Design a protein around this ligand. Structure first.
Ligand SMILES: [Cl-]
Ligand SMILES: [Cl-]
Ligand SMILES: [Cl-]
Ligand SMILES: [Cl-]
Ligand SMILES: [Cu+2]
Length: 97
């Protein structure tokens, strides 16, 4: 199983326009089988790419199609670990005006 240890932007934090989201897990995850939904006050936000840059596959980089505008964001994640096991969660953050 892959449990979410931390994320940037951090849950319930307020940040200036981040370039991407970075979700760090307790075991490797598979970008090809993992799903991530991003929404801004109900509005689905386009994601252009998912990728695990590192050998250990523990960090998932989620790249929006467009730079994030100010607002309230929710992340819904369904992770698939290298052992094929499924985990899921959600969290929110804010992009400061
Ligand atoms: Cl992270
Ligand atoms: Cl995040
Ligand atoms: Cl999305
Ligand atoms: Cl998992
Ligand atoms: Cu498992």
């Amino acid at each position: 199983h892959a449990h979410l240890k931390s994320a940037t932007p951090a849950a319930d934090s307020t940040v200036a326009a981040p370039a991407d989201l970075r979700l760090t897990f307790s075991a490797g995850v598979e970008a090809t089988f993992t799903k991530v939904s991003l929404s801004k006050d109900g509005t689905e936000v386009a994601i252009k790419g998912l990728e695990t840059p590192d050998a250990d596959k523990k960090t998932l980089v989620v790249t929006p199609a467009a730079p994030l505008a100010a607002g309230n964001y929710k992340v819904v994640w369904n992770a698939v670990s290298v052992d094929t096991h499924k985990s899921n969660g959600e969290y929110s953050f804010k992009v400061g005006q």
